[PDB]
């Protein structure tokens, strides 16, 4: 009951683990924070386990965060997606819009905006868990 799995993907170790640490005290043990170091690790985790919220960097070698998304729009319980990037890139944002991202946060993320996005994402997750009837 109640406990959601949040996957944070970033190819920079300090950004990845820092964000993990931020979310881990924001969750206060109520949720499960996990991390991946790149797009292939994230895809591996996404295919083997329920992820409710996906928080991912966009620019990663070989497989971008947008690439990851296009593999999940092709699946059943696709997670709610927050993208993150150091780049205010309109092309990424436009593609992200077209793929249904919930938030595009810029680095470094203000923990105010980051907590806000995850809460909306956790909420959006419950909304489509109830459409099994």
Residue positions forming the annotated binding site: 11, 57, 59
Distance of CA 93 to the CA centre of its chain: 15
The reply to whether 9 sits near Mg ion by the rule CB under 5 A is no
Among 11, 31, 96, 102, binds Mg ion (CB under 5 A): 11
How many other β-carbons are positioned within 10 Å of the β-carbon of residue 50? 10
Q: How far apart are CA 56 and CA 84, in angstroms?
A: 6
The interface with Mg ion within residues 44-83 (CB under 5 A) comprises 57, 59
In angstroms, the CA 114 to CA 22 distance is 9
Nearest approach, Cβ of 59 to Mg ion (angstroms)? 5
By CB under 5 A, which span of 3-11, 27-35, 41-49, 107-115 interacts with Mg ion?
3-11
Within 10 angstroms of residue 24's Cβ, the number of other Cβ atoms is: 16
Residue 87 in contact with Mg ion, rule: CB under 5 A: no
The residue range among 9-17, 66-74, 99-107, 119-127 that interacts with Mg ion, by the rule CB under 5 A, is: 9-17
Contact 9, 41 (CB under 8 A): yes
Residues that bind Mg ion (CB under 5 A): 11, 57, 59
């Amino acid at each position: 009951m109640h406990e959601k799995t949040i996957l944070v993907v970033d190819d920079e170790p300090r950004a990845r683990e820092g964000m993990k640490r931020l979310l881990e005290k924001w969750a206060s043990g109520k949720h499960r924070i996990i991390t991946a170091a790149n797009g292939q690790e994230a895809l591996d985790i996404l295919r083997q386990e329920r992820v409710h919220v996906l928080l991912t960097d966009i620019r990663m070698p070989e497989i971008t965060g947008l690439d990851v998304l296009e593999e999940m729009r092709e699946k059943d319980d696709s997670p709610a997606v927050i993208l993150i990037s150091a780049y205010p890139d309109f092309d990424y944002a436009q593609k992200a819009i077209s793929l249904g991202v919930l938030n595009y946060l810029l680095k470094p993320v203000k923990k105010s905006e980051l907590f806000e996005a995850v809460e909306k994402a956790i909420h959006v997750s419950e909304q489509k868990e109830r459409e099994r009837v």
